[PDB]
Design a protein around this ligand. Structure first.
Ligand SMILES: [K+]
Ligand SMILES: [K+]
Ligand SMILES: [K+]
Ligand SMILES: [K+]
Ligand SMILES: [K+]
Ligand SMILES: [K+]
Ligand SMILES: [K+]
Ligand SMILES: [K+]
Ligand SMILES: [K+]
Ligand SMILES: [K+]
Ligand SMILES: [K+]
Ligand SMILES: [K+]
Ligand SMILES: [K+]
Ligand SMILES: [K+]
Ligand SMILES: [K+]
Ligand SMILES: [K+]
Ligand SMILES: [K+]
Ligand SMILES: [K+]
Ligand SMILES: [K+]
Ligand SMILES: [K+]
Ligand SMILES: [K+]
Ligand SMILES: [K+]
Ligand SMILES: [K+]
Ligand SMILES: [K+]
Ligand SMILES: [K+]
Ligand SMILES: [K+]
Ligand SMILES: [K+]
Ligand SMILES: [Mg+2]
Ligand SMILES: [Mg+2]
Ligand SMILES: [Mg+2]
Ligand SMILES: [Mg+2]
Ligand SMILES: [Mg+2]
Ligand SMILES: [Mg+2]
Ligand SMILES: [Mg+2]
Ligand SMILES: [Mg+2]
Ligand SMILES: [Mg+2]
Ligand SMILES: [Mg+2]
Ligand SMILES: [Mg+2]
Ligand SMILES: [Mg+2]
Ligand SMILES: [Mg+2]
Ligand SMILES: [Mg+2]
Ligand SMILES: [Mg+2]
Ligand SMILES: [Mg+2]
Ligand SMILES: [Mg+2]
Ligand SMILES: [Mg+2]
Ligand SMILES: [Mg+2]
Ligand SMILES: [Mg+2]
Ligand SMILES: [Mg+2]
Ligand SMILES: [Mg+2]
Ligand SMILES: [Mg+2]
Ligand SMILES: [Mg+2]
Ligand SMILES: [Mg+2]
Ligand SMILES: [Mg+2]
Ligand SMILES: [Mg+2]
Ligand SMILES: [Mg+2]
Ligand SMILES: [Mg+2]
Ligand SMILES: [Mg+2]
Ligand SMILES: [Mg+2]
Ligand SMILES: [Mg+2]
Ligand SMILES: [Mg+2]
Ligand SMILES: [Mg+2]
Ligand SMILES: [Mg+2]
Ligand SMILES: [Mg+2]
Lengths: 64, 50, 146
RNA sequence: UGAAAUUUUAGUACCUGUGAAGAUGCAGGUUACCCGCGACAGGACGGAAAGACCCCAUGGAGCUUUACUGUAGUUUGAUAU
RNA sequence: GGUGUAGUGGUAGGAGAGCGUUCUAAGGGCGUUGAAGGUCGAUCGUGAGGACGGCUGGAGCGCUUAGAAGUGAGAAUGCCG
RNA sequence: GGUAGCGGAGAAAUUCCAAACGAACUUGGAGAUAGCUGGUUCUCUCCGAAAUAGCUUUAGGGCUAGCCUCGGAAUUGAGAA
RNA sequence: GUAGCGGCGAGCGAAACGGGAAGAGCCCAAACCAACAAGCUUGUUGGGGUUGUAGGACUCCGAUAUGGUAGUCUGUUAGUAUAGUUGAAGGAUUUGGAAAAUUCCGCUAAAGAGGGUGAAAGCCCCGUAGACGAAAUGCUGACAACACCUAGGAGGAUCCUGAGUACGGCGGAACACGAGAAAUUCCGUCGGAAUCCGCGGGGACCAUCCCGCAAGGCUAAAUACUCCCUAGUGACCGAUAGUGAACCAGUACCGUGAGGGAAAGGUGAAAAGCACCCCGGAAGGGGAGUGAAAUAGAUCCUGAAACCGUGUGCCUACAACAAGUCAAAGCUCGUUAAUGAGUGAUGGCGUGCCUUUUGUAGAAUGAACCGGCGAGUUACGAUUGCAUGCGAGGUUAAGUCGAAGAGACGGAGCCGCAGCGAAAGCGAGUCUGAAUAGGGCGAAUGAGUAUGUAGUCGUAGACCCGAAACCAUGUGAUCUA
């Protein structure tokens, strides 16, 4: 059968032009009083999936 | 060429001969045969097909 | 070629590796699986992305965004491709399709200015970038919105 | 007349020591001509049973309750007849 | 192909190159003047393995190239004899 | 002759229900599942580990990194002593 | 594997558009009219009518045609199925028991598919190509016959157009959609409409617009499957294989019963299956015969290993042995003729194989021995390497024709050529931001795609064997309570 896509990942990541995966940042839901404004400002920015994590999950996003 | 039924009938039974119509010719047939005896009309039809 | 002298192109075909066929082969006994453990069992191994119970990366990360029901994506074409036509040519979505430049137009053709235009053309497309429109006009041509 | 459990192959000694720390098989020494029969049961950690004790498995099953979630029944009301 | 230098223990495991088995295609062969198979031999190759001769046997079988695999056993208290 | 397994029967022992009853026997779901034990068959050549860190209802499992192997790219040569 | 669903986990997962196979549309209820009977309506029958660019009734006109059928044991006809007939061409030579094999000359082919015949046959036989054939019964198609459907235009004043229905509340269920914002569809319960200025849907809901007309029914083809029958096919099995069953197999056997369930093929070309004689009670042998062969004698082709036994070339009764290896006198023998073979006094060294382990000769595990069988495979996807074709392009899928082939057509569709953003949107840029700033992701800085093959992974039992168990049908009180 067709290989299925991991819907959770599909919702949380985006494929970039270079083949990488763009992702959100954790610790951006609540309890912002426990983080400095610098932390919040720098977590607002997106990021890319690390090499090790990408090698673990790529097969689940092949046909995203 | 299509329609040469009598030629096909007289030739098919020979052990060394394989008969095919110009419209129905295949890589395997050509390669297997050591020689290819083709009528002029058959060659024309082959060229048109290819 | 002769059926009794067939020869594949070098490197075109390889020999399958069979495991569990003696020690000297290098994959005897354990068949390259190692010794015991979950991965050494038939049907063994954990599901993709599993991390042994540590919260997986997707669980850590938050969901984001939404898909617009009325999303419109345009088939994109550039001045470099437009250069393939002759001066005075009437470029149309049908013309592009027949030329094979745009097999699938999606919501319609949008023209971008990645390349440098050189031919005078009358280009008809769903949308035009500002730079693309200026380049077409500078090349002596004209643009119309279908 | 005629089985069986067992059985890696065995030309299958003792002491001290060594060794996965308790050796017929390894080291040193000692003893011992070859093959049996009738008896004994120290050893072959002897045979029989993939230990039941103990621990482990995000195993099973039976049982309990003020564990959780359900539920048959029982009861109460609305409503239809 | 030659010279030189260096290197060539190895479990898990990775890479490469090969042997052998059955079958398919093509080509080229072998067989009651004895095939396969069995057995014996003091044979050849670096290895898996390959020949050759004697005997038994009595009808199918190699070889080269390529292709496909129910393709290689010594262990599973494996199954059957 | 009657009582049949989500059951029956029980002067009550988890006692009996066709020589193993804390839930009979047979068939099917079914090749249940087994992070566990056992087994996994030809050859040679090159190279060759780990038994660690982090996290884990995690501890004899797993994931990423570390250590091995094969291919590739590039360098103001960045490695070792 | 998209949109979505989902302790938003594990997973589940569409539909429309587009491309194809096949194609077919029709009947009522109601209004209205007539007949009949009863009790002006009220039931039966007939006529009438079947719809959304609203239709029908009804009222006018004009037509009494034109076409069709998804009807019939109605006939006629053609074909076909169920037996069959015909169907070319070789003799010698050598070996051999036997010729098809060898050699020499020939012959046939619309037949050189295949099978059998004393070994391997185009020309020996059965067949094959081709030609031909049906008294009888089926089946199919056509023809006719019968049968049944088939009307156009105009007006709306009124009438009809499916009621306990649609819908709503409550509780469930099906829709990929798990109540969620929830459409749509279905069930149970209760409430409960409108009706052409009407009604439903377009994913809560309202308005506009668009599309359609429920609560009645029927309908061939394309699709699914094979217990069977016929004709074939296979890089399918070849007697531990292949159906459990090649053989008197669901048999023997086991169980009270449901149920479980085997083993077992081969003489020879032809029985020519050993007349007769001898030992023996027979069995079984030895002759004699058959046969090419009887060590092919019915336990019958071949006849391996374990295991057993006979004969003997060498060694062995002072020796402590994982049984070998290295060295070696003596004796024996003469081979793929090799700086040979067998045996071996004696001396040196030396604790099996496998599994699992930090570590095993291990007093840890497994194997009594021999033989056979017995474990990473395939399908569909993902990704990487290698290879080929093409190349800013690559490529067809279903499907039609065709030998179960290749191949041709089929461009719908898929990947690539533009990215950025959650999105509107912009675009070699874009997002953030007040910013022509910075920064992120991209372009400059270009190769992809189809297929083959291999490595790995995913869904599948997924390398093989193994639970205690769980669940759903059944069979058991001939034991025992
Ligand atoms: K995210
Ligand atoms: K947070
Ligand atoms: K491996
Ligand atoms: K030990
Ligand atoms: K004893
Ligand atoms: K129990
Ligand atoms: K065994
Ligand atoms: K009792
Ligand atoms: K899909
Ligand atoms: K979960
Ligand atoms: K009518
Ligand atoms: K004959
Ligand atoms: K023949
Ligand atoms: K007939
Ligand atoms: K709903
Ligand atoms: K509609
Ligand atoms: K014989
Ligand atoms: K002997
Ligand atoms: K010795
Ligand atoms: K033990
Ligand atoms: K900026
Ligand atoms: K920028
Ligand atoms: K390529
Ligand atoms: K590939
Ligand atoms: K499997
Ligand atoms: K696999
Ligand atoms: K009784
Ligand atoms: Mg902090
Ligand atoms: Mg292959
Ligand atoms: Mg290895
Ligand atoms: Mg092994
Ligand atoms: Mg193991
Ligand atoms: Mg371990
Ligand atoms: Mg492991
Ligand atoms: Mg000690
Ligand atoms: Mg000791
Ligand atoms: Mg010893
Ligand atoms: Mg014991
Ligand atoms: Mg145990
Ligand atoms: Mg053979
Ligand atoms: Mg095998
Ligand atoms: Mg064995
Ligand atoms: Mg008790
Ligand atoms: Mg009992
Ligand atoms: Mg199941
Ligand atoms: Mg946890
Ligand atoms: Mg004839
Ligand atoms: Mg002849
Ligand atoms: Mg549902
Ligand atoms: Mg309701
Ligand atoms: Mg509705
Ligand atoms: Mg809407
Ligand atoms: Mg309409
Ligand atoms: Mg149908
Ligand atoms: Mg046999
Ligand atoms: Mg059988
Ligand atoms: Mg013999
Ligand atoms: Mg025999
Ligand atoms: Mg002495
Ligand atoms: Mg002596
Ligand atoms: Mg230990
Ligand atoms: Mg044992
Ligand atoms: Mg009774």
């Amino acid at each position: 059968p067709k290989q299925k896509t991991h819907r959770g990942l599909a919702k949380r990541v985006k494929r970039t032009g270079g083949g990488g995966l763009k992702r959100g940042r954790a610790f951006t839901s609540h309890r912002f009083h426990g983080k400095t404004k610098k932390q919040r400002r720098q977590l607002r920015k997106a990021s890319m999936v690390a090499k090790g994590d990408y090698k673990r999950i790529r097969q689940q996003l092949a046909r995203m | 060429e299509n329609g040469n039924d009598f030629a096909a009938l007289s030739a098919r039974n020979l052990p060394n001969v394989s008969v095919v119509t110009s419209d129905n010719v295949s890589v395997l047939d050509v390669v297997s045969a050591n020689k290819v005896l083709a009528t002029q009309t058959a060659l024309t039809q082959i060229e048109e097909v290819l | 070629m002769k059926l009794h002298e067939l020869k594949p192109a070098e490197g075109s075909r390889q020999v399958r590796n069979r495991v569990g066929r003696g020690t000297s082969s290098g994959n005897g006994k354990t068949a390259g699986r190692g010794q015991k453990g979950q991965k050494a069992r038939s049907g063994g191994g954990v599901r993709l992305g599993f991390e042994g119970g540590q919260t997986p990366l997707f669980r850590r990360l938050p969901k984001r965004g939404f898909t617009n029901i009325n999303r419109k994506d345009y088939a994109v074409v550039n001045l470099d491709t437009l250069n393939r036509f002759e001066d005075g040519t009437e470029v149309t979505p049908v013309v592009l399709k027949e030329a094979g430049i745009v097999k699938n137009e999606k919501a319609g053709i949008k023209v971008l200015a990645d390349g440098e235009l050189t031919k005078k053309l009358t280009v008809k497309a769903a949308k035009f970038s500002k730079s693309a429109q200026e380049a077409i006009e500078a090349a002596g041509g004209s643009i119309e919105v279908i």
